[PDB]
Homo-oligomer: 161 residues x 6
């Protein structure tokens, strides 16, 4: 169990097994971007290969932006445009209640069946917890969102004091 | 009149007056990203301040991706999701014929009236010319797309030989 | 109240409200560079717009370099050349005693009236606390140094053990 | 046919089909690093996915460093240590004469059978042409060096005047 | 005594006196790269000049990769190819037992006498401790590995919990 | 003789022998930053070691900013504050007439004797040619400005058409 502090964003979280940070700059402004290692280890000290069709973003959710249920739905809709900007239809929608050590939240999940029959279906899970924090886990039919792990990641969020 | 070569993307173009390149890395894979200087000059040798609500992207349009009229409409719809991922309504739509030294193309323009009444309206102009190249010019009601300059930029595109 | 550790520089500090880290690399060698958000929030996970006419630098002050009163005056004079390299006259000078949880220091403030009548006046506040640490807060007549917040930032410095 | 100038390194070359530049910084000091696109196109304007098990480096070969036949063999031996630092045996060695528009050179190729039976065999082709320039094309049994294309790349090198 | 946490790699370590972090990105995936300051201090807030012929890398050693004695020897052999890819002979070999607060490990050291008589001899110290962590300290005859400090660095490693 | 184009800044120039570009980003906005190699060659394809006490900046000189004689003196005074922000006295001043293929300009040179007796004297040469372009060559008593080469660099500037 690996806990990561994000002091600018005011929270800590548990790093999902098999994931690394994608860059350092997100932490400058209170966010975090994570990538999934492929499992093939790099030479020691060098950066590991990571998947290009899945990613996780988390951070403080600005008080100016966006109930946690309504917020996660709205954020999830916007995130899906930003990360999956191709025409398609939303299918297999779900909402999930969150409880991060007693701090309530909500998440919205859905899949995108793209108009392009050669594109794998997109998948997106967006959680809001709470001061408020968000978690977005993006994947595809070939590299699916791990819904149980996304819930565990959001429920691992703790405010820093 | 400043002409810029993009050898990986197979084209050259005229840099719009008052704009600079935003980074060098786009040219690595045959694209270009431009930013608009604010007019307040920096110390010599240092990077100029640029606007944060307008941008231009141009590059080779992959033969796998997307008539030029249909292509610019589809690309413009996707670009507007990617750059303006908030809910809203498309208004003030236009299409524009392009002629780049005899190479035909088409562009699609529209504005977005956002659901959020405090967001300025978004503006996007997307052109496809042609091997094919694209031009996307993004702005807002406070920093509008210069439609005549966007047409001139797309019509300035020349294949490199 | 957000406390940030800088382990290479041997100190922690309280992040001023409304400010973010400008990059990650400063911490590699025991410094920190901060930028002021404009208040217009970015899309979640993306970097916020920041002001281009104000900045804060802090870090360990090398034992080889530069009383804390004399040190802050000398450092402030050099910092003003580095950040405001245009001809002008220093006006509205002040010195300020510092007490960081019992660790004494001193700061030097002044404004620059530039020879160029179209340049807004520059403002710089430079503090030395203490092992020694420095704080430099730069602004202009349009985006002034918050002198009370600069004193609070310097007095928030704690050695790490 | 896409020709790329490298003014600091004093040469131009033909970009192999399906390859892009990996970064811009190599050109600062007269080299070039190329990566192979996977074929899955990115969103327009965004960087394409590239293979992680093949790469090409080319540049001016310092007059202080390293006949072209002896030079390519020595450089190839060193490059194979640098890029394939695991124990193994060199097999399937070849040397290839080069003629770049009348400028002679030589290349050395070999494969590495690694001690680790789960590692795919490494492949490396190293050419020296000539002022002198080098070309290194690295691959594996799963993503082999295209020997004909590596020879064409080295023979495409032209001095800039 | 300066202790640095590496949460992705699951460890903390004591920063050797006179060394700084070379970049921030290594920590993204659980490694750290350190550079040695030259002693000439930079302007405050700016990065210090560092030596170009010595470096330290440390990180988690993948369970898939590589007894600690055998592991450090094998890793040291591979690291010496990666960092010193020129022909030469290994001389002055040593192995060193490690004890990091009761966690055992081993290190392998050797020097390289290069075929090129104008190259200074290379030096490399590679330690494995332990979950397992590695430490590599690289130097030359002109800027030698500090063997006592490398042992202290490896023995300063503590798992994070 | 190596000529480099800077299309955003509207000029080309001859690269001084032994110098490389320091980064790619300066060209994005019409400037160039050059560093001096130490002569010790790197491994092929890797960046060469460069001096840390000398540098060259060149670029378009904004029509809003700053006769060429008065301009070079004023720019040289400001550049010396920016690059040598320590107290001292200007000595050994010179001005130099420039003629870049018939385009006139002027340069201002001076040395700085620092108050700190352990700092080597600073040296700065600043030229303005002309649309106008600037050249700044910075050095020290240990790594002096090559005045003849700085004049040749400024006189090598040609407008791009
Ligand atoms: Hg994957
Ligand atoms: Hg603007
Ligand atoms: Hg501002
Ligand atoms: Hg591949
Ligand atoms: Hg050194
Ligand atoms: Hg030097």
């Amino acid at each position: 169990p690996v806990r990561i502090d994000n002091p600018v964003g005011g929270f800590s979280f548990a790093l999902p097994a098999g994931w690394v940070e994608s860059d350092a700059a997100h932490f400058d402004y209170g966010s975090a971007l994570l990538s999934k290692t492929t499992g093939d280890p790099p030479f020691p000290g060098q950066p590991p290969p990571v998947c290009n069709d899945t990613r996780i973003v988390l951070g403080r959710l600005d008080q100016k932006l966006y109930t946690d249920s309504k917020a996660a739905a709205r954020l999830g809709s916007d995130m899906g445009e930003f990360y999956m900007p191709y025409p398609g239809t939303r299918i297999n929608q779900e909402t999930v209640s969150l409880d991060a050590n007693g701090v309530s939240g909500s998440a919205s999940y859905y899949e995108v069946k793209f108009s392009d029959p050669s594109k794998p279906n997109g998948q997106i899970w967006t959680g809001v917890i709470g001061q408020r924090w968000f978690v977005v886990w993006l994947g595809t039919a070939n590299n699916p969102v791990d819904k149980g792990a996304a819930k565990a990641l959001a429920e691992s969020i703790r405010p820093l004091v």
